[PDB]
Amino acid sequence: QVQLQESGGGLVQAGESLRLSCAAGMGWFRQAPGKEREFVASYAMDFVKGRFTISRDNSKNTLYLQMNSLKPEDTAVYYCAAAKYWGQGTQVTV
Amino acid sequence: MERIKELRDLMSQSRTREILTKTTVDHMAIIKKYTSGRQEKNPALRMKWMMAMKYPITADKRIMEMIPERNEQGQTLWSKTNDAGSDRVMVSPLAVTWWNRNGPTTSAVHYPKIYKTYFEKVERLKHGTFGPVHFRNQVKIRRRVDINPGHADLSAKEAQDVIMEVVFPNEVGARILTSESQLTITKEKKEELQDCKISPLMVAYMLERELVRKTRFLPVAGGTSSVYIEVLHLTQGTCWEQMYTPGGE
Amino acid sequence: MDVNPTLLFLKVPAQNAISTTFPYTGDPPYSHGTGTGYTMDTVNRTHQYSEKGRWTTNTETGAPQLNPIDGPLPEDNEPSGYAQTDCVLEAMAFLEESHPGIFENSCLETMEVVQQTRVDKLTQGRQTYDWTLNRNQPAATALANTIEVFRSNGLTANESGRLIDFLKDVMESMDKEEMEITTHFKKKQRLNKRSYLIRALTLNTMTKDAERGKLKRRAIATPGMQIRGFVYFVETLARSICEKLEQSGLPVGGNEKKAKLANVVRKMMTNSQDTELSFTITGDNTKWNENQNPRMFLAMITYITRNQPEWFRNVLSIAPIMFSNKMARLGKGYMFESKSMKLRTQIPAEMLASIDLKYFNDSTRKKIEKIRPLLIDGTASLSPGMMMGMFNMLSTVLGVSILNLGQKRYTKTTYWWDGLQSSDDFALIVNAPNHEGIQAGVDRFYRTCKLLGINMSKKKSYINRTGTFEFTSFFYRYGFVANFSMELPSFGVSGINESADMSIGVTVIKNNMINNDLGPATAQMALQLFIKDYRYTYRCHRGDTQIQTRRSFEIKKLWEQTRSKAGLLVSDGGPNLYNIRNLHIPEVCLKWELMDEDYQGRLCNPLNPFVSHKEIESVNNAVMMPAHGPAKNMEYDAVATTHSWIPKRNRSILNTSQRGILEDEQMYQKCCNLFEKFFPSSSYRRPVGISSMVEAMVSRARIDARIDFESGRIKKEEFAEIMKICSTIEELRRQ
Amino acid sequence: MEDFVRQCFNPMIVELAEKAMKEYGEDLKIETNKFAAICTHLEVCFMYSDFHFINERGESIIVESGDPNALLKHRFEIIEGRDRTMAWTVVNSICNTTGAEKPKFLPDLYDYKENRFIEIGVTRREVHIYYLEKANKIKSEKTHIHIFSFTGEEMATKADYTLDEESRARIKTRLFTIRQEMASRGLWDSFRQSERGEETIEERFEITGTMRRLADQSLPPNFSSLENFRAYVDGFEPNGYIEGKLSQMSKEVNARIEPFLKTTPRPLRLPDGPPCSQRSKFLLMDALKLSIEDPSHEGEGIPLYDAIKCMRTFFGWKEPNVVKPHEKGINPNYLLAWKQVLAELQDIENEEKIPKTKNMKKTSQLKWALGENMAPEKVDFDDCKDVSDLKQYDSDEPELRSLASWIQSEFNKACELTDSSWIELDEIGEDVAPIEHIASMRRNYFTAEVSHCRATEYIMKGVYINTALLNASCAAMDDFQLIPMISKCRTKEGRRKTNLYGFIIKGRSHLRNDTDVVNFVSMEFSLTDPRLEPHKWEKYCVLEIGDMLLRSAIGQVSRPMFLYVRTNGTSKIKMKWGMEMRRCLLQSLQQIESMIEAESSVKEKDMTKEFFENKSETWPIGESPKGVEEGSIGKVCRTLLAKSVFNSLYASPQLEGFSAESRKLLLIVQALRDNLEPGTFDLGGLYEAIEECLINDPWVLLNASWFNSFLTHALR
RNA sequence: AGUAGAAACAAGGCC
RNA sequence: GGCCUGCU
């Protein structure tokens, strides 16, 4: 019943910014190439706190993840999730 | 006889009849407190302002038939103009002093028996023995202490039934007091005040004050006894201690 | 040489002579005219501290309301009412965790009280805004008028005699199409749904007088009678909660406040080792009431009442629901003067919505322009925040939650803090290993306060090392120091009556000797001055003097008539036997053994026409509004003498269209006196039941005539006369 | 089943049973058999009680209809049919009058012959079980019990049946009528067993209708219904949400502590403008006294005669003339008022007995001086809207005025000793305890120190003037009244003396509100020439009225003697507070006694005598150009008394605001001097709060100057 | 005029 | 001119 599509990923410079959006409680999760899933935001993880901000428009049915001051260690597929329902993910490469 | 007669007279007039009919017993209190008189915000200012008027106090209508309208020189003692929202008439303060020099006299022998607390205080102080004043810093520490020295180990509600059965034996209702201490208190205060005619309400109030235990938080240094706390102002100070032993001990 | 008292502080520490800095010997400031300007200013200020919220229009009242909750976080140190729901819920959760079982217990006792409370408890209150007449009236009068209107409209559940049933009727009135009210000028007027909603949700605004300690005047509010029961229940719950919190100081007295302050300072400093530094902040909160949103109180209570019967939750939630939609009456109005034509005019505040702005100055013009959008039917919507400390206890609960949120278990850092909160005032003791730690702790405390809609007044606050601080005019310097300047205004004649004034004065001297460290010689001087003022006020001079007054003749003849003149009361022109040892004895009992039996009997005569006693509550209780504090009641020891008269009433009702209230007063008092003569316990214990007056009175007449014959004065002739007179009044009540 | 009670029973019983139904709060539609059963119980109660009368004998007289007579006594008097409160009222009354025992449950009837209760109950079941059932329900009962049952049988203990048997035949005929009438109805499928003692109820407080919608509009911004918000709250648990917002919140939201050092505090700025004027209601430093040396006490005497006698003691009167005009009024009116006062004083002197209180004529002079008929007439807005001049009352910050040096000298000479005792204290109970003796000795020392002080004279002047003014306003509301300023002192030689400073004319004083103003005109003699400090007398009109000769070694001075005349006003609150000026004595001497006690707590001994006699210890109580000057404890007493007196005289909102906002800074400075590392969050805000209270009041400006001097001397 | 200070008093209303 | 009220 809940389909999800992520937008707003891509190639960015280190120290740059990026606004992920997921069209549909909700979470943003990430997967680096050599690992399983990592919690980003729902609350934010230690590795992304202060840099990254999660915000939703319930009238647009969209969840946003505003990433700033990006590091090479953010480089992952960023997946959106609804709580059981998972997006396909958007590639972010820093 | 009389009581039902003014009852019938009240029911004669339509408005009072309606008030008596539609008003239920529970609303008794409400309508009794129903008044247009606001509670004064600055009592001192108006007491100093009203006493400069003629006829500043109020008294029952009966005053018009016990005290003459004027004294020897013609200073008026009472007026026939009633108060705002009562049948009482406004009268001059002289009508008080007049009542204390030529008014009716009675036998006040039973007031000491009624106002037990105050007379016990007086008796305790009259036989007290003072001692030397010692000047040294007093470490006043704040503690919860009982101020009433005659409390019979009863709470407010606990002694309220006792008070009713002592004064209003018929309105007690379901309650029949179980504790035997209450039994003896009822017996004593019943046989003692059997014909006292001060007022049921004041008798009940003073019995409540005497029997009910009351407690307050105060800065004390030493003492801590009920008899030693009523004179806490006289025995303990900022830098002086006055040894005292009430007459009871 | 020029004299300068302030230089005295160069040798005597400031707190040891702080009494000199309290000019409480002169007339306190008073307001003279309308309080409409202050009301409008307060409304605008409350609405602009939450400007960044979101606007809506209520579908029932049609008024614009501003919701700032969960709004943007503040980016400046200015006052802000943008409280965050999640943060406050978390604070309450931590409060519960640190004090398990607090909410459940408090809710249990509150449920007991609510389901056993009676309607008459609402009469025990000061002025309340009666909507039947759109004016402030005594609580009992407003309650009676509202009950009469409800019964006339068909809402008679309050006849059950239960406050919960009265509130049920109040809520049911909200869903009525058309109510009816009475007005005298009697005319029956019809109020539609919206008009009655606004009349039940509105507040009456006045100006606070006798307020010492500030140059500018403020405005205060009084709610109606429909919302006071819910407020009573909510405050009962909040009091039961705070009584379980040692960090709160609102539900206690002054001495308890001092004891708790001493305990907390000793706990904080003593536990601190040599390495930890300690600092005390003497904080005041700016715009405390204007920044507390009722929706947040709703959230706090619904979190408190979790896992409780739904009816309890609903009845406790009704109050903040009405405060969130509360309206405020602008006030008396505005008075204009024309010097060219030499006249004056008084326009009511309700015209501010439509009246042109040519008559108003720039400041008032702008205030009206800003407040007009919120004007609905002559009253302004005040949703964003509380007006004047109606929820004192819930605000104290929130402050105590903030204080407890730094117990070093939630700080997660070396620094920590504690202290005491009493609404609008607090003392905060913060300990940390270094000045940087103290700075971080205070910064985080301030930030957390700003997340709950609470602001700290930086201008009226300062931080020093622990050992010296202030709290509600109590100056602590290694131990609390007496002031005695706060109680100075209470050293005169109270203004109740002669005996009451004497007893109250001596008792006040005694108490201030016990608590405020009043000196012996100072107490004797106070006694002398009080006696002088008492004699000069009541025209009762020593009697042996030649001071001619309106009462000096009767007093002098009483003096010359009496043999043992030492027993005469000061009220009757006798000598004063009071002293430091006799301050706890009533005057009558101190002079009892010296009075002549004739004068003693004349004085304490039950048949005197002056003494009047109404209820057990008003026997020896005097309401003295203390300086720099809320109205308080005192028990004063006094003997019922001929001097216990009650003074004259206002008597100005005779010139007003509300003149019939006096006739109703007289008739109600006549009926009440008759009932009391029929039911002697009417005063001491308020009667209960569901029957009507005449039934009880006639039936008790039956029985008492019977039994008083079975032994007493009655006779068969009289008993039968009473029986058939009872039948006569029965058939009269039939028709 | 209710149709039966519709049909058979009379109204009286059915509404009695309906009110008994309402009594315990259960509804009649759910279970009605109880209604029928208890109404039949009530019916048997009536039918058993009525038709049964007694006369002075026992042996009840039974009449089918009560004949007109006094002989209508009822044999059995009913208990039930009444509310619980009244049922217990009758129970208690019977017990207290009959001397019988009080039952714990409700009886049904009382009887005289046997002087006891009857508890009638007719149950469906047979008697011989229900009887002992209710008997074991009732503990140790002497009330006789009697029950019937439908089969027709009767029983009772003692084999006692208390009245006629034809009545009981009546009862059982009624009983079987009931029975074989239900026979036509058919109710015994439940009649025998229909009540089992159910007592339960659930309290229901439901939010619905409009009040529910209001609940839906009192939630956080992103909630739609109270149901959803309560569900969210119940499901809410702490998951570190305060930390997230604290991290996200801007760092500019801080409470940084600014260190408070010696160089931090700056002197308070005083307002600049025209010099400050005099506001007192009477002359303080420039007063003059005409005396008689009479033996009367303060209140003893008659005012007008004393004033006239004092004024006749002075010779050298001259025709009055203007010296310094009011600069805003009509000085000739003041001149004419003075001459009118003199003329009417003579008029009183001529007649038989000096009146206790005199009323003056309402001439145009005092009509203007007292501001009569100047209040604008009150009208309605609908009649005055086109008037361009119509606007609000002038509401702006008061005029700014700079401090002058006269208030400093006035306070200086308000703390100086005098050649008289201005306090005659009342009596107290003879001291019995040693502590009372110590208190009395201390009090005597302070009275000796402060009685000879200008502050006490000002206290007495203000108290007397305000008392007289208030009493005259309350008594003579309409008509202008003359009141001579009188104060009685005692000389060093011990001779009592009276002093007449001048006169006060009170005007119309119809004071309703505590803020309503009563206007009067005050005239006071003096010798101080007003040509040296004119700015201090902006609102006064000063005439030349005579010459005075006081004995001096320089021949004899023959100084001029002027009259300060002005229009002033007060209010009920101001009069009341000025008539309680004696508490300044309290304030001051409480402070001094606190000092003495604090010092004596160090040395275990009372330290009053050496403080007042040796005068070794001194406190900083003023600054001279040489430096800070210290004085003995008595001078501190007088200084504090003068400070309190001036607080009571120049009271104003400015004083309160400045006092509070300067006590804050004083506490901060004290913390600094105590080495307690004081800190502030916004000191500029506190300074601005203090500086906004200083506008035009001489007293508050002098206090601010004193505070600046204290800061300058402190912080070292 | 005067009192006082963010608005008022310097009598009100009723005939 | 006559009368009413002084916290309504």
Author numbering:
A (entry chain F): 1 to 24, 33 to 50, 59 to 99, 112 to 122
B (entry chain C): 1 to 249
C (entry chain B): 1 to 185, 207 to 756
D (entry chain A): 1 to 716
Question: Which statements did the authors publish about this structure?
Answer:
Using cryo-EM we determined the structure of 17 polymerase-nanobody complexes at resolutions between 4.5 and 6.7 Å; this is sufficient resolution to accurately position each nanobody bound to the polymerase heterotrimer. On the PA linker (site 2), that links the N-terminal PA endonuclease domain and the PA C-terminal domain and wraps around PB1, we observe three nanobodies; Nb8202 and Nb8210 bind identically at residues 220–240 and Nb8204 binds at residues 250–265. In addition to the core of the polymerase which was resolved in all structures, the PA endonuclease was resolved in the majority of structures (excluding Nb8189, Nb8190, Nb8192, Nb8196, Nb8202), while the C-terminal domains of PB2 remained unresolved in all structures.
Central to the replication cycle of influenza viruses is the viral RNA-dependent RNA polymerase which transcribes and replicates the viral RNA genome. The influenza virus RNA-dependent RNA polymerase is a heterotrimeric multifunctional machine composed of polymerase basic 1 (PB1), polymerase basic 2 (PB2) and polymerase acidic (PA) subunits, that catalyzes both primer-independent replication (vRNA to complementary RNA (cRNA) and cRNA to vRNA synthesis) and primer-dependent transcription (vRNA to mRNA synthesis) in the nucleus of infected cells. PB1 houses the polymerase active site, whereas PB2 and PA contain, respectively, cap-binding and endonuclease domains required for transcription initiation by cap-snatching. High-resolution structures of the complete viral polymerase from a number of human, avian and bat influenza A viruses, as well as influenza B, C, and D viruses have been determined. These structures have revealed that the polymerase is a highly flexible macromolecule that can assume a variety of distinct conformations, enabling the polymerase to perform both transcription and replication that require different initiation and termination mechanisms.
